[PDB]
Amino acid sequence: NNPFYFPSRRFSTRYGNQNGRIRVLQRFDQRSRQFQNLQNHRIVQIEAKPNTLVLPKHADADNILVIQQGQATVTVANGNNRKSFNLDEGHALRIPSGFISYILNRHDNQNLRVAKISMPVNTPGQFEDFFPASSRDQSSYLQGFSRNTLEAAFNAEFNEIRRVLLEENANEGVIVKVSKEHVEELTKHAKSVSEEGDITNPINLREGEPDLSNNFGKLFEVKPDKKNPQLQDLDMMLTCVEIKEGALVLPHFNSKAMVIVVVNKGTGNLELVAVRKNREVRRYTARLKEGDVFIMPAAHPVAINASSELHLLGFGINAENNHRIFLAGDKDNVIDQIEKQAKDLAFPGSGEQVEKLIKNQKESHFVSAR
Amino acid sequence: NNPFYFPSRRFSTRYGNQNGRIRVLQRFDQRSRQFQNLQNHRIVQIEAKPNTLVLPKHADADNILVIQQGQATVTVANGNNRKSFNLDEGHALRIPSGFISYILNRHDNQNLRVAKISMPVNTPGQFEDFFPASSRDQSSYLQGFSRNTLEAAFNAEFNEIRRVLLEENNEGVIVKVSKEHVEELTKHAKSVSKKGGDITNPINLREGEPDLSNNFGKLFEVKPDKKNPQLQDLDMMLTCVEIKEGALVLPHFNSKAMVIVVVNKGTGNLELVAVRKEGSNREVRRYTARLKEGDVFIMPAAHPVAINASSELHLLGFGINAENNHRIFLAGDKDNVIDQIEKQAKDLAFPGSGEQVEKLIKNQKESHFVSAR
Amino acid sequence: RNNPFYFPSRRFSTRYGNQNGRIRVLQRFDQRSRQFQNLQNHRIVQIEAKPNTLVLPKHADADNILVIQQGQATVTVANGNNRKSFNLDEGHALRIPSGFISYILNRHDNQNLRVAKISMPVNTPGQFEDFFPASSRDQSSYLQGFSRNTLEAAFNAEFNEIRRVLLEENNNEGVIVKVSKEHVEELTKHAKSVSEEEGDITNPINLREGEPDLSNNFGKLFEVKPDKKNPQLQDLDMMLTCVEIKEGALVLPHFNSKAMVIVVVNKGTGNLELVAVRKEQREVRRYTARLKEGDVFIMPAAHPVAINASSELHLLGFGINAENNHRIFLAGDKDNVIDQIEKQAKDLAFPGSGEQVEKLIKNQKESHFVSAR
């Protein structure tokens, strides 16, 4: 009924067992053709129990992962290097396609929640995970090669190769339980957020001062610019918005960015306004819950009311030179920038009346829903 | 019958009243699949009566507008800034998606004609205009929000909000403006003559010296390069060609740019040559059209084109995939690629000898544009 | 069609062909399978020409990189104001921008010429046409597409002279013609061998220039990457790769991290193993093919691949999405990513202990290429 809204139910789990699960949202362009531009963006949500490890793999997709909740140790490896990072909530990490990575929940009793945006390299909207080891969920890709090839490659008997690499490990699946001793082994090397062979360092989305901030909300944003060259390559921005309970983000829009937003935490109500076929204004609404996804098309006015402390994670594509533009309040209010005489000709009220009404809201960006 | 030709009839009007109209060309890829690469480019033509104003709005499309005829005052506003520009014929202005703009015909008695290329951001080939105010043509998008949201947002009673912002002001989206209002809207208008929050200055397409020029024609071109960084972002070039009455642009093509051209003024005849399969044996196909003001046509890359002017012909060209494009000619002295073929190669390829081919080629002493006699 | 990544020479269809040679074009990749949609705008052309033979002047509405697979050529590139002729040997590559005229001389007395081309259409995804200025039994001159009046005004001559020297069929063989020894020497007299660039006529690239990236007794891999040294490869975001695998040797399981590669077999025979993870009809799928000269296959990014040479195997690779690509190995010493997994992670992932995994991995002391025995 609301094509911009993707409830957690629209996620299907790809890997899942007692230790956690890897869920993947449906392709956006399958929902509606108005998301064709988002066709090559898939949202992944990973949940892992304490002292749990997502086994090594690579995908034929480029990735940015962000910690929604908890604490992780994420490792990235290419042909000649490995780096392990301790990631906290609101930290992001780029994982280039074809690099191996694995994810440790390094917490004793808190669950790990991770959000990923995957951008397939080969087939628009489609990617696969490639595990070097076998498990009950999937075989090692090494099994795809012949006996002769494997033996020549590893310089060893097929029976040894099969015994140590190819068999199913002693079977949980791709997310396994890890002993305290093993956990400490895996975190000894990790470094915390605060380059080499395209293994780039983690980004702290909440680094420094928020772009927008008052008593009712904060918006943090990491833009595609000199400070983050890799975001330039992707033409993406990463945004973290926190809306206090009982507060509202004023009607606003991104001028050119299209944003996929996931609800990291909290509840609230989405209003999204659109013009469609002489021309009618359509209102779309949704009750936001943790794990939900929604799409903010560029230049479509949006307002969001927080039922409880609301944490939203935004992946913005087509982000270069984006402006986040407001329709009420003092700062960033584009309606205010219309010339007085133009306001007078456009609106029912006089220019004076329009300009007065506009000055009623003394605050900017976020205000109380009261 | 000619898929490259789009007569003014193929425009449908989206907004229209006594004061003018906003017309939009059909999606190019709906005509034919050979225009799939142009799918995200829509042509808009705006006509406005004197002392008339196209009301504030933004689109979910990136825009370049060009004055085809008359004089305008165009205002662009974002979240923290506003700039107003006096634009004359042949002046272009970039309006980023989501920025508000409005268009004043500041002339007392001459109509304003404006051409726009719109490139949708969300849905390939589709965009919508978003008006903050209501009118008989459309509701304010502010009406899409709830009473509670509006009241909290504006810090005011819904009744006041509805009274001053939400009600219908009626005329439509293009309204009549009093002389006094007109003078108010033009009072701080800039006349930028050269480049100077992503509110970029107007471009003069006829700035400086034309690329090509003789007694029969001129071609002006603004290329995607350091001088116009925004054209680099778009990988686009803007071209203005003026062909004298009774003159002909020589057979030629763009090496890699695809060009959407609109006929700003005049009449003429288009010849476009494509190679098409009837695998096996393929044939040369000739496409023609009688060009009239307001017509659009597509110049696919590397397809030879010639244009004969029935009367002073002004053509506006929006070139995509423009970087490192070469406009290459098939006759005449300068830019003639056939001339660059080695003499021995000419001899082997053509029916005549190398000497005969080279002599025939030297007959045309002129370049680019010649008399249709 | 059992292995969608493999394209045997039979899947090429000849577009132009006669006694002197033939121009063959591979089917569109996305018509085979939708997993090749990203390769939709890349067509593979294979040209074969007899000794002292010339492929007649033409341009395409496609961008092109050509590479000499075998023999020796003189290739000429012409735009509106310039011409350059290049002597190209095996493993030399040349960029031919769309809309530029080019022709290809087999300058050898008795060896055949084989040329591979990657064409990227400008107008219509996956589709392009060749535009010949001259007529032949295979195609008419595009100049015939223009009217008598236009031609006469353009060339400043009688239509009868124009038709006689330019438009008639040059008894006609086709687009590949025989050339006399004297004509051949005429065409090679100004050819350069592998100077400052000029009007986007860029110089030839030697794929085997300098030192190979990977090299040992069993194989070599040469690569030209999109970087400052080859600005035009940057524009294309492409890499060009030349791999030579000794008879009886194997390229270790490996993959490109992000590049998608179209590879053509220039010479030799071998066996392809390509591993894909896929959804059950999650399972590992093995694809194989017997490689022969003229075959094409697709290496999707991040899909493990191993290749066994039945005889000296020369592979030419066109890599798209190439920037920051890493060629990553799954066995051997250097570039082995499995080796980079932490010991404790190896232990948790694999059936063996970390120590056992790390020992087994050190068995193969060599890198990249090893003996198939």
Which residues are bridge partners to C329 per DSSP? C254, C336
Query: How far out from the chain centre does Cα A45 lie?
Result: 9
| Cα-based distances in Å from A363 to A354, B245, C277 | 17, 61, 54
**What residue type is B348 in one-letter code?**
L
The reply to whether C43 and C133 lie within a common domain is yes
Closest partner CB to B273 (pick from C85, C97, C142): C142
Neighbours of chain B (3+ CB pairs under 8 A): A, C
Nearest to A269 by CA among A253, A298, A292: A292
| Rounded CA separation C145/B274 (Å) | 8
A366 to chain B: closest CA residue: B153
Q: Which domain holds residue B53?
A: 1-193
Query: Mind spelling out the 3-state secondary structure of A241-254?
Result: EEECCCEEEEEEEE
| Rounded CA separation C116/A219 (Å) | 53
Neighbours of chain C (3+ CB pairs under 8 A): A, B
Structural contact between residues C93 and C207, judged by C-beta atoms closer than 8 angstroms? yes
Closest partner CB to A326 (pick from B56, B79, B184): B79
Structural contact between residues C46 and B293, judged by C-beta atoms closer than 8 angstroms? no
The reply to whether B39 and B111 lie within a common domain is yes
Is B298 buried (19+), middle (13-18) or exposed (0-12) by CB count in 10 A? buried
The reply to whether A232 and A186 lie within a common domain is no
Closest partner CB to A176 (pick from C282, C321, C348): C348
CA dihedral of residues C252, C256, C260, C264 (deg, nearest 10): -30
Residue linked to tokens 């133009």: A342
Site from C23, C123, C150, C160 to mutate, B interface, most B CB atoms within 10 angstroms = C123
| Cα-based distances in Å from B40 to A36, C5, C30, C87, C235 | 12, 31, 22, 42, 22
The reply to whether B131 and B225 lie within a common domain is no
Helix or strand run (H / E) with residue B354: helix B354-362
Backbone angles phi, psi at B193, to 5 degrees: -110, -10
Helix or strand run (H / E) with residue A233: helix A229-234
Q: Identify the three-state secondary structure at position B355.
A: helix
Q: Name the CA radius of gyration of chain B, rounded.
A: 24
| Rounded CA separation A82/A100 (Å) | 9
Helix or strand run (H / E) with residue B5: strand B5-6
The reply to whether C90 and C107 lie within a common domain is yes
Backbone angles phi, psi at A150, to 5 degrees: -60, -45
The reply to whether A92 and A188 lie within a common domain is yes
Site from B342, B353, B359, B362 to mutate, C interface, most C CB atoms within 10 angstroms = B342
Strand arrangement, sheet containing A42-48: A11-17, A20-25, A42-48, A112-120, A61-69, A91-95, A203-204
Instruction: Determine if residue B20 is left, alpha or beta; phi over 0 gives left, psi from -120 to 50 gives alpha, anything else beta.
Output: left
| Rounded CA separation C331/A176 (Å) | 25
Q: Which residues contact B3 (CB under 8 A, 6 or more apart)?
A: B31, B32, B34, B35, B287
Q: Which residues contact B260 (CB under 8 A, 6 or more apart)?
A: B28, B38, B41, B43, B117, B296, B297, B298, B299, B317, B318, B319, B320
| Cα-based distances in Å from C217 to B235, C220, C248, C249, C370 | 47, 8, 11, 9, 8
Backbone angles phi, psi at A181, to 5 degrees: -70, -40
The reply to whether B321 touches chain C by the CB within 8 Å rule is yes
| Rounded CA separation B217/B248 (Å) | 8
| Whether A256 and B62 lie within 8 Å, measured CB to CB | yes
DSSP assignment letter at B66: E
| Whether C326 and A98 lie within 8 Å, measured CB to CB | yes
Chain B nearest CA to C136, separation (Å): 9
Angle B13-B16-B21 from CA coordinates, rounded to 5°: 75
> Resolution for this model in angstroms, one decimal place?
2.4
Question: How would you classify the pairing of strands B327-329 and B247-254?
Answer: antiparallel
DSSP assignment letter at A198: T
| Rounded CA separation A202/A71 (Å) | 13
The reply to whether A182 and A243 lie within a common domain is no
Structural contact between residues B118 and B44, judged by C-beta atoms closer than 8 angstroms? yes
Structural domain ending residue among the three candidates B135, B168, B193: B193
The reply to whether A217 and A319 lie within a common domain is yes
Query: How far out from the chain centre does Cα A243 lie?
Result: 18
| Whether C146 and B271 lie within 8 Å, measured CB to CB | yes
| Rounded CA separation B209/B134 (Å) | 45
The reply to whether B142 touches chain A by the CB within 8 Å rule is yes
Query: Mind spelling out the 3-state secondary structure of C231-265?
Result: HHHHHHCEEEEEEEECCCEEEEEEEECCCEEEEEE
Which residues are bridge partners to C68 per DSSP? C115
Site from C5, C37, C41, C282 to mutate, A interface, most A CB atoms within 10 angstroms = C282
Residues 59-98 of C with CB under 8 A from A: none
DSSP assignment letter at C181: H
Structural contact between residues A139 and C284, judged by C-beta atoms closer than 8 angstroms? yes
The reply to whether B144 touches chain A by the CB within 8 Å rule is yes
Query: How far out from the chain centre does Cα B212 lie?
Result: 20
The reply to whether B290 touches chain C by the CB within 8 Å rule is no
What length does chain B have? Answer: 373
Query: How far out from the chain centre does Cα B63 lie?
Result: 10
| Rounded CA separation C128/B150 (Å) | 55
Q: Identify the three-state secondary structure at position B48.
A: strand
What length does chain A have? Answer: 370
Contacting residues of A for C4, CB less than 8 Å apart: none
Q: What's the domain count of chain B?
A: 2
| Rounded CA separation C129/C123 (Å) | 10
Structural contact between residues C7 and C26, judged by C-beta atoms closer than 8 angstroms? yes
The reply to whether C144 touches chain A by the CB within 8 Å rule is no
Closest partner CB to C258 (pick from A98, A148, A164): A98
Structural contact between residues C230 and C205, judged by C-beta atoms closer than 8 angstroms? yes
Q: What is the CB neighbour count within 10 angstroms for residue C175?
A: 27
| Rounded CA separation A224/A238 (Å) | 9
| Whether A154 and C286 lie within 8 Å, measured CB to CB | no
DSSP assignment letter at A169: P
Residue linked to tokens 């669950």: A111
CATH of the domain at B27: 2.60.120.10
| Rounded CA separation B93/B81 (Å) | 16
DSSP assignment letter at A110: S
Q: Which two tokens stand for residue B138?
A: 């459309």
Q: What is the CB neighbour count within 10 angstroms for residue B206?
A: 15
Structural contact between residues C330 and C253, judged by C-beta atoms closer than 8 angstroms? yes
Chain A nearest CA to C304, separation (Å): 8
| Rounded CA separation B248/C95 (Å) | 33
Query: Mind spelling out the 3-state secondary structure of C87-147?
Result: EEECCEEEEECCCCEEEEEECCCCCCEEEEEEEEECCECCECCEECCCEECCECCHHHHCC
| Whether B122 and A34 lie within 8 Å, measured CB to CB | yes
Neighbours of chain A (3+ CB pairs under 8 A): B, C
Q: Which two tokens stand for residue C82?
A: 């310039």
Structural contact between residues C344 and C310, judged by C-beta atoms closer than 8 angstroms? no
Q: Which two tokens stand for residue B342?
A: 């080695």
Structural domain ending residue among the three candidates A143, A159, A194: A194
The reply to whether B348 touches chain C by the CB within 8 Å rule is yes
Backbone angles phi, psi at B305, to 5 degrees: -135, 140
Backbone angles phi, psi at C315, to 5 degrees: -115, 135
**What residue type is B299 in one-letter code?**
M
| Rounded CA separation C324/B167 (Å) | 56
The reply to whether A165 and A211 lie within a common domain is no
Residue linked to tokens 């498990």: A135
The reply to whether B155 touches chain C by the CB within 8 Å rule is no
The reply to whether C151 and C13 lie within a common domain is yes
B322 to chain C: closest CA residue: C122
| Whether C301 and A75 lie within 8 Å, measured CB to CB | no
Question: How would you classify the pairing of strands A191-192 and A82-88?
Answer: parallel
The reply to whether A270 and A317 lie within a common domain is yes
Q: Which residues contact C362 (CB under 8 A, 6 or more apart)?
A: none
Chain B nearest CA to A210, separation (Å): 18
Structural domain ending residue among the three candidates A175, A194, A213: A194
Nearest to B79 by CA among A207, A299, A240: A299
| Whether C80 and B321 lie within 8 Å, measured CB to CB | no
Query: Mind spelling out the 3-state secondary structure of B211-257?
Result: CEEECCEEEEEECCCCCCHHHHHHCEEEEEEEECCCEEEEEEEECCC
Backbone angles phi, psi at C118, to 5 degrees: -110, 120
Strands (E), A153-227: 175-177, 191-192, 203-204, 212-214, 217-222
Closest partner CB to C145 (pick from B256, B304, B357): B304
Chain B nearest CA to C260, separation (Å): 22
Structural contact between residues C32 and C1, judged by C-beta atoms closer than 8 angstroms? yes
The reply to whether B161 touches chain A by the CB within 8 Å rule is yes
Q: Name the CA radius of gyration of chain A, rounded.
A: 23
For C92-108, give one letter per residue: b (16+ CB within 10 A) or e: bbbbbbbbbbbbbbbbb
Q: Which residues contact A181 (CB under 8 A, 6 or more apart)?
A: none
Backbone angles phi, psi at C319, to 5 degrees: -100, 125
Q: Identify the three-state secondary structure at position B63.
A: strand
Which residues are bridge partners to C238 per DSSP? C320
The reply to whether C182 and C207 lie within a common domain is no
| Whether A298 and B154 lie within 8 Å, measured CB to CB | no
